[PDB]
């Protein structure tokens, strides 16, 4: 059992610069049989370098591998927009083999203030016994953001899954949606529902709320 840990999880790079990916192994690998893979969301993963030193057919020469033992580094010269995908390091000397957590590289951009909108549940949806309150964040950077639900001054926990979209191809921004799920009886026992959004580019937190019966 060889445990592979990759760090950092997310890194912000710029096109044309150099990116270094680190791969940590829990023990030495015989014959340095470590390979790197490239995977794009939607499509299938593709092999780039096998044995950490030999490239494969149809792979550009700008990808270079180095290191041995328990330390391996992947250096890429001439970063391209299409290269902002997730990369995994894997060793095939274990039998059975193991895979790492993987690292994601994002395009570095300036901080943009997010937009917060909240939609109260519809009357038709209330008839089904389920109430859904949404909290939408759009055009923010970096991806790291805290979304907390506060209703009747009581902080909620254990009831938010959280969905986040991928990086925009033309805007390089991120968006995420937060959905609040509660019982119909509990919904009628609360008046004001608000979600708090905290951002690096905001001096003070911005809170949005609505009054039941007015929407």
């Amino acid at each position: 059992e060889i445990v592979l840990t990759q760090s950092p999880g997310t890194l912000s790079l710029s096109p044309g610069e150099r990116a270094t990916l680190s791969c940590r192994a829990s023990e030495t690998v015989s014959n340095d049989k470590v390979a790197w893979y490239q995977q794009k969301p939607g499509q299938a993963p593709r092999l780039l370098i096998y044995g950490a030193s030999s490239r494969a057919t149809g792979i550009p020469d700008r990808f270079s591998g180095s290191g041995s033992g328990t330390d391996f580094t992947l250096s890429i010269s001439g970063l391209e927009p299409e290269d902002f995908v997730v990369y995994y390091c894997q060793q095939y000397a274990s039998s059975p083999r193991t895979f790492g957590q993987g690292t994601k590289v994002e395009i570095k951009r300036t901080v943009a203030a997010p937009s917060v909108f909240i939609f109260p549940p519809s009357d038709e949806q209330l008839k089904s016994g389920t109430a859904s309150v949404v909290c939408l964040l759009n055009n923010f950077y970096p991806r790291e953001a805290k979304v907390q639900w506060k209703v009747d001054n009581a902080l909620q926990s254990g009831n938010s899954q959280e969905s986040v979209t991928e990086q925009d191809s033309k805007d390089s921004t991120y968006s995420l949606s937060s959905t609040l799920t509660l019982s119909k009886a509990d919904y009628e026992k609360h008046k004001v529902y608000a979600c708090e959004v905290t951002h690096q580019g905001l001096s003070s937190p911005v809170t949005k709320s609505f009054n039941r019966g007015e929407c």
Partner: protein, 225 residues
């Protein structure tokens, strides 16, 4: 060299799951060549299930030992995978690859297939209108959304049209999340505030193309004026 996967798109928990990896253009006769299965749950990394070498040599993962079986049929040139004790947390997309030697591992990858493990049934999606309750802050533009809920499997495309059947460029697609055995997703669209206080069109239609029904509900604008 190419690979193709096939199997059921919906399987109930605690049952038998069977997948077939269809490959053509090579034979598993030379040494070093082998076939392996790699799965990846959404939002997680790749997971190694098992690998089979030549001369009927098979390898299994100790974390999943005594739970998977590897069988090969040279006549049909396709490996058969059997999965038992299905669990909702094990839902992932399964891929198979060919190793062209001892050092070149997984040189060619196929396309894969989504195998959803949910106790529920493939019911038609349900749409719910969303009214914008924003006030005292018109901001740049106003936003209206569409909550597609109770759909399985996750395959939905969103398109926004006006009352006169026009075209809108939203491109705001949120991924689905497994909540209570069902997938939930949200979609929004940005519209200028000037158009709201102008044309008599007070609502727009939300359209979803899912292979369980062609319903399309309309979301009324809150109107500011």
């Amino acid at each position: 060299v190419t690979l193709k996967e096939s199997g059921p798109t919906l399987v109930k928990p605690t049952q038998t799951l069977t997948l077939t990896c269809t490959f053509s253009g090579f034979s598993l006769t030379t040494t070093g060549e082998g076939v392996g299965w790699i799965r990846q749950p959404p939002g997680k990394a790749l997971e190694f299930l098992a690998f089979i070498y030549w001369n009927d040599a098979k390898r299994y993962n100790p974390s999943l030992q005594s739970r998977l079986t590897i069988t090969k049929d040279a006549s049909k040139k396709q490996v058969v995978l059997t999965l038992t004790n299905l669990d909702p947390v094990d839902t992932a997309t399964y891929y198979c690859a060919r190793t062209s030697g001892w050092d070149i591992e997984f040189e060619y990858w196929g396309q894969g297939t989504l195998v959803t493990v949910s106790s529920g049934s493939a019911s038609a999606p349900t749409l719910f209108p969303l009214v914008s309750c924003e006030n005292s802050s018109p901001s740049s533009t106003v936003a209206v959304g569409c909550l597609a809920q109770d759909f399985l499997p996750d395959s939905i495309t969103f398109s926004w049209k006006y009352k006169n059947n026009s075209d809108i460029s939203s491109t705001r697609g949120f991924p689905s999340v497994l909540r209570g055995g069902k997938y939930a997703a949200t979609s929004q669209v940005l519209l200028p505030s000037k158009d709201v206080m102008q044309g008599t069109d007070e609502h727009v239609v939300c359209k979803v193309q899912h292979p369980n029904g062609n319903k399309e509900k309309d979301v009324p604008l809150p109107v500011v004026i």
